[PDB]
């Protein structure tokens, strides 16, 4: 507990980052996470939506 | 452009609409500007037999 600021530095980092990457993968209301399955199930107009 | 269908074939001719025929025949854009003006002509194209 003597390198608390590096270590929180590095931590917040990578913490960004982890985070990033998971919100990468939300629906954020659609209806897949994945652009190839909606583009597979739906048509070019709801797909495009 | 000028053409005869039939009664449900009204809604397959728009932009964005799915359809056999729409997909076979005549398909507008994605990003179609413009319009249909659909009338009924049974009186001229429907003869008897």
């Given amino acids: 507990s003597a390198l608390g600021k590096l270590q929180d530095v590095v931590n917040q980092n990578a913490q960004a980052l982890n985070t990033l ?29 | 452009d000028s053409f005869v269908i039939r009664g ?19 398909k507008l854009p994605d990003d179609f500007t413009g319009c249909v003006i659909a009338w009924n002509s049974n009186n001229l194209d429907s003869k008897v037999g």
């Fill in chain 2, 8 to 26: 449900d074939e009204v809604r397959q001719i728009a932009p964005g609409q799915t359809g056999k025929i729409a997909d076979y025949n005549y």
């Fill in chain 1, 21 to 49: 990457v998971k919100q990468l993968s939300s629906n954020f209301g659609a209806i897949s996470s994945v652009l190839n399955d909606i583009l597979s199930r739906l048509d070019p107009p709801e797909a495009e939506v």
